[PDB]
Design a protein around this ligand. Structure first.
Ligand code: RET
Ligand code: RET
Ligand code: RET
Ligand code: OLA
Ligand code: OLA
Ligand code: OLA
Ligand code: OLA
Ligand code: OLA
Ligand code: OLA
Ligand code: OLA
Ligand code: OLA
Ligand code: OLA
Ligand code: OLA
Ligand code: OLA
Ligand code: OLA
Ligand code: OLA
Ligand code: OLA
Ligand code: OLA
Lengths: 204, 204, 204
């Protein structure tokens, strides 16, 4: 069952990486790297060796969150640059991004008060991560808010519902939802904003 | 017993991270990041899944040294910048710092000639790490020597005594000593030097 | 048997790191770092805890490929700078380098269609990695082609033959071949090019 979801993820991001490589300039291509890393992550989840038991008889694939530490750092780089954050602020927000994903994987893997403790830690770093973005004085703020509020913030809600958290929804339901969020935050994100982000980076 | 030490560490660095975030400029805040990472590390040590047997019936929490690879890289960044090292020298010293901590975790985890071999490797990198700092022509050298000599260099001595090394002192004694060294090198360090380091970074 | 090969590797790169540290400028010394990391990697392979079964009754030491993610990123930095790639292109190629090694370790460790899938992924990233180098308009291109074609590209061929891939050659034969390739790409590389690369970096 869930194998079909993972294979869908492998196929979609293989096509996405191929399109992003050929369609964009042969230089630093973050859209290609984000998609290529996501393929690696979906193959490892499909292989099935790093599953763990989750809430209410579900399963957890905690390497998903560890891989987001890399792929979402690339996305935060693009987002913060698009909002013309300073260099030292871009670095800071990339660090918070790694911290959010790393503690989130820990929250998914561990149990009891440790799940709760890690989830809280991750949530604090996350609030500190998105406050400077959502209150940015950049005119690009609105174009960026929709991915932060709908996509990025969709993940902790999904997590709480999934076997990663309380286990209200099944492992396959969570995985489909994670894949939709992945497509929105990693593929649509670039279809939508690639042109504006590219023009912006050339002016700074 | 040792749970009380780890919980003390979680509480102290939670308070420290909160103070450093609010008291300092809302930009790249290394003092906040160093403390936040240390919380993560103490929670993982408290959870207890990554303990291993150490010398003389003691225990080893080798993930402490792996986490120092990240948090101490941030500290070395501040220290080398404070001494006005060049950019390429700052990078070099951050690499040596990761190497020291990474091989140190290996030394703590493994046994026999491998403990000795990794300890030596870590000690060589460490000598190369601190020689340019202790012989710096910067007038900030003295302000920096005390953390290097008393705090940073306290760790390999503690390690040799602890179950990580020969096991002369118990796991709880080592942990208390590691926590004191942590407080000195990560919290007092900033109480002491934050102002001078901040003024210095604004001039370069 | 294979212990002798690993100990040869530890000894050679210990001597190489010592020569590179003393002979070159006391600044960012990538030749020293590459060799020092390779020592760490050979000691871990000698210790023997992270072996896995490979093809035709052979063994796989997959941490070799994970460590190349770090040491080869340093080499790609030098190579791309020597070819006067832009900064954003240098970063891109270092990312591809980590991806090649990381998926390569996965390919070595896993089995069946997962070995094949990861090997292909690694091979695609690798083609994208070396195409901008082999078609560079730099006059340094030829001096660089020989390490890419003979050394870097030697590894996937060796991998396919080794127990990492089809298991046509024994684990000890593969290890000797990996060590020769290591010496060529990490030690001869600098004996050959250190002067030209150093003079080049001073002009950019
Ligand atoms: C795949 C792409 C993205 C942008 C994924 C982003 C994921 C998050 C923002 C997840 C955040 C979490 C929080 C805030 C707290 C619990 C654990 C999570 C990792 C799900
Ligand atoms: C938590 C903050 C700091 C600054 C910790 C620093 C740790 C060291 C300098 C440890 C060094 C080691 C050496 C030199 C050799 C044996 C293994 C150790 C990691 C303890
Ligand atoms: C130790 C130094 C170097 C430069 C090692 C380089 C290794 C490679 C270029 C290996 C590439 C691989 C490919 C392309 C595909 C299968 C897995 C490998 C990692 C062997
Ligand atoms: C050509 C431009 C770059 C294209 C981007 C990446 C393209 C993806 C290529 C190959 C993907 C291999 C997929 C692995 C299949 C795994 C199946 C399995 O393990 O069961
Ligand atoms: C690098 C970015 C994230 C990598 C972490 C994921 C670890 C994956 C697999 C562990 C294999 C253990 C057997
Ligand atoms: C615990 C989580 C594990 C994953 C680790 C991820 C760490 C990688 C972090 C950041 C990668 C650096 C991205 C730099 C983009 C710069 C682009 C440019 O300069 O053009
Ligand atoms: C920057 C701070 C990074 C913090 C990293 C936190 C480490 C994450 C903790 C646990 C995730 C490991 C996933 C386990 C894989 C499944 C294992 C199994 O098969 O039982
Ligand atoms: C926006 C949200 C849309 C709904 C989330 C998608 C989950 C689909 C689950 C499909 C299934 O469980 O069969
Ligand atoms: C508000 C500014 C930022 C504050 C810095 C971080 C504050 C720490 C917040 C929550 C810490 C959660 C502690 C986890 C408890 C673990 C207990 C257990 O696992 O038994
Ligand atoms: C990132 C910086 C240091 C992270 C390494 C620590 C690994 C922690 C936990 C491993 C979980 C395995 C179950
Ligand atoms: C094996 C050890 C595992 C831990 C890995 C740690 C690697 C992280 C290293 C360095 C982080 C980069 C810090 C950059 C600070 C720059 C600050 C600024 O530019 O304002
Ligand atoms: C930059 C070079 C970095 C080198 C990294 C060296 C790897 C460190 C080796 C071992 C540390 C792993 C800690 C083991 C956790 C406990 C496992 C257990 O529960 O038995
Ligand atoms: C400076 C050094 C001070 C002593 C180190 C602290 C160790 C306290 C151990 C307390 C105990 O073992 O009960
Ligand atoms: C002095 C300049 C720097 C020199 C570079 C590094 C020199 C290497 C030094 C010590 C290497 C220790 C080798 C470890 C032996 C392992 C043997 C074993 O584990 O069986
Ligand atoms: C950092 C660069 C590469 C490090 C990855 C290698 C991991 C090594 C040993 C794992 C120890 C587990 C017991
Ligand atoms: C999965 C593979 C694990 C290994 C991770 C390796 C990641 C490290 C990557 C790059 C290190 C950065 C090198 C920077 C060199 C800059 C030199 C300079 O500025 O003078
Ligand atoms: C940048 C993308 C990086 C991707 C990282 C891929 C993770 C590599 C996967 C597996 C390698 C782990 C090696 C296992 C050690 C031997 C374990 C054993 O003793 O059974
Ligand atoms: C160039 C290639 C030279 C041959 C590769 C070296 C392999 C030597 C194997 C020695 C042995 O198997 O006894």
């Amino acid at each position: 069952q869930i194998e079909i979801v993972f294979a869908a993820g492998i196929a979609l991001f293989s096509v996405a990486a191929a399109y992003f490589f050929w369609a964009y300039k042969k230089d630093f291509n973050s859209a290609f790297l984000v998609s290529f890393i996501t393929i690696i992550s979906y193959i490892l989840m499909l292989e099935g060796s790093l599953v763990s038991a989750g809430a209410r008889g579900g399963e957890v694939y905690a390497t998903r969150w560890l891989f987001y530490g890399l792929s979402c750092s690339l996305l935060m780089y693009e987002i913060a640059r698009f909002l013309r954050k300073s260099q030292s602020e871009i670095v800071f927000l990339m660090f918070l991004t790694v911290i959010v994903m790393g503690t989130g994987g820990a929250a998914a893997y561990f149990e009891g008060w440790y799940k709760i403790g890690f989830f809280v830690l991750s949530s604090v770093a996350y609030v500190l991560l998105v406050y400077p973005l959502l209150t940015s004085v950049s005119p690009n703020r609105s174009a960026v808010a929709k991915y932060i509020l709908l996509g990025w913030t969709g993940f902790p809600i999904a997590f709480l519902l999934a076997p990663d958290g309380f286990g209200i929804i099944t492992t396959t339901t969570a995985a489909i939802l994670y894949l939709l969020l992945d497509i929105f935050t990693k593929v649509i994100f670039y279809f939508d904003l690639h042109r504006k982000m590219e023009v912006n980076a050339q002016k700074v």
